[PDB]
Each structure stands twice: as structure tokens, then as C-alpha cells.
Design a binder for this molecule. Structure first.
Ligand SMILES: Nc1ncnc2c1ncn2[C@@H]1O[C@H](COP(=O)(O)O)[C@@H](OP(=O)(O)O)[C@H]1O
Ligand code: NA
Length: 253
């Protein structure tokens, strides 16, 4: 097709929860648009200073009114220079992002609920008594992440699930929240403005939805498996720096 000049503003809002292929989507969107896509990895690797801003934003998020305008302004500030949002903490703000970027299209990445929970327990939210949690935390300290990072994850999940609090160790609670979240998105977002993606779908329905060519000679990204995060965590602990191992994870980070 012809090359056209794309606007550097949020064009794609992905409501999918963590562990539903958000990092592959992030990579895919950056291949299509040639500008950055927001993701928790963007915070972790490029903008740790955003952590407190997202935390402040979620804090005020219970509140067009005037209180809303201040919040929408900070959302816009955080996302300046990006062409899309994925992953925590953005995903639970999909309703607001749709108001802020009226010309953006909405994606929902879904997958088998037990596969999701299993993946989540290995990476994002291990149980308190799970020994692997201590390894995750140790690898994370190497990246410069502390308890405020875990708090951001916790609070952005509560916010996505619209819960005042959440028993994070409770599998049933999380599964019910997962199903209701995905249901609510499809109920809320007008169908012409929404594409539901399943893992393995690849380029075609995404590119169709976005009116772009499928990228030539480039496979749809398949990164950020829990197996890969286990290897990353272990290598971080082993070498005690990111820059000593960064070359071993070329696409993932
Ligand atoms: N193209 C693809 N096909 C199948 N699974 C994919 C995929 N891209 C990512 N995934 C899976 O999506 C999960 C990561 O999602 P996220 O980036 O949002 O954390 C991982 O699941 P598993 O941990 O079950 O392997 C990963 O394997
Ligand atoms: Na399976």
C-alpha cells in the first residue's frame, strides 16, 4: 500500500488484562506505527518516574466535570508521544481513554481463564506463600523496583476490577473478576469500535481493523511467556544487573 503520515497520538486503546498477550501487542503496534506503545515495560525500563504519577492518578480516580478534567489532563500528559496503550496500569482506564481520544479504536485481548491465572501467578501476582515470589522480588530489586511498584500493580488491578479491596491470594475471586472484566468491556464498547483478539490470531484481524497492510516478512510477535520471565528473573539474580544480560532478551525488552 501507499505510505501515509500517521498522527502521533493514541490511536489504539487495548483493554486486555496483563498476561493476555499485551507485550506482543505492544511490539506489534510499534511495528505498524513506528512510534512507542505504552505498557508496564515502558514504565519499568524507560519511565520509572511515572510510577508515582500513575499512583496519584489512581488515588484521585474515584472522583464532563472539573475534577475529571484534571484527571484527563494527567492521563494525556502521561501518554504524550505514544500511539497506543496496553497492559496495567492503563487498561482499566479504557472508558476514560475513549473519551480523551474519541478517534482511537479499542482492542480486547482474551484467553482461557485458567491459562491466564496460571500465567499471572508465575509473573504478576504469585501467592504470598509461593517461594517464587521471593525470586521475583530479588530480580526486581536489580531493575530498581521496590514496594511502590508492587503497589501500582495492586492498585491498578483493583481499579480495573472496580474493587475497593481485593484478596490477591484468592484464585476464585481473580477468576470471577477476570470474566466480569472481559464481559463488561464487550458490553461497554460499541462493537464497531472494538476488536476482540485471541492469542494466536496474529496480524490479519488486527491489521484489517486498523486499515493497515500486514507488515512484510515480519512474524507477529510472540514474547513474554512466563517461561521467558522466569529466565529473566533468574538471570537478573545471577548477574545483578540488566545491562549485563540485556542482549540475551532482544525483543522482549
Ligand atoms: N503470539 C502469541 N501466541 C500465543 N501466546 C502468546 C503470544 N504472545 C504472547 N503470548 C502469551 O501471552 C502471555 C503474556 O502476556 P502479557 O505480555 O500481557 O504479559 C504469555 O502467556 P504464558 O505465560 O501462558 O506463556 C505468552 O506466552
Ligand atoms: Na493449552
Amino acid at each position: 500500500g501507499a505510505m501515509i503520515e500517521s498522527s502521533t497520538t493514541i490511536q489504539v486503546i487495548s483493554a486486555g488484562l496483563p498476561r493476555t498477550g499485551t507485550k506482543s501487542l505492544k511490539n506489534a503496534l510499534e511495528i505498524i506505527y513506528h512510534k512507542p506503545c505504552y505498557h508496564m515495560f515502558e514504565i519499568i525500563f524507560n519511565k520509572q518516574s511515572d510510577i508515582i504519577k500513575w499512583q496519584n492518578l489512581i488515588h484521585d480516580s474515584h472522583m464532563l466535570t472539573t475534577k475529571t478534567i484534571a484527571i484527563y489532563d494527567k492521563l494525556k500528559e502521561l501518554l504524550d508521544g505514544y500511539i497506543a496503550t496496553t497492559d496495567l496500569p492503563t487498561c482499566g482506564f479504557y472508558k476514560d481513554l475513549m473519551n480523551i481520544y474519541p478517534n482511537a479504536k479499542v482492542l480486547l485481548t482474551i484467553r482461557d481463564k485458567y491459562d491466564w491465572l496460571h500465567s499471572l501467578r508465575k509473573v504478576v501476582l504469585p501467592k504470598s506463600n509461593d517461594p517464587w515470589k521471593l525470586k521475583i522480588e530479588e530480580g526486581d530489586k536489580v531493575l530498581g523496583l521496590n514496594s511502590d511498584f508492587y503497589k501500582l500493580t495492586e492498585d491498578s488491578l483493583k481499579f480495573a476490577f472496580q474493587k475497593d479491596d481485593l484478596n490477591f491470594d484468592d484464585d476464585q475471586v481473580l477468576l470471577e473478576c477476570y470474566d466480569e472484566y472481559n464481559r463488561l468491556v464487550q458490553e461497554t464498547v460499541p462493537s464497531d469500535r472494538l476488536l476482540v483478539l485471541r492469542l494466536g490470531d496474529g496480524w490479519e484481524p488486527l491489521c484489517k481493523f486498523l486499515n493497515v497492510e500486514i507488515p512484510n516478512g515480519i512474524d507477529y510477535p510472540c514474547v513474554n511467556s512466563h517461561h521467558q520471565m522466569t529466565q529473566l528473573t533468574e538471570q537478573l539474580i545471577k548477574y545483578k544487573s540488566l545491562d549485563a544480560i540485556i542482549h540475551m532478551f532482544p525483543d522482549l525488552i
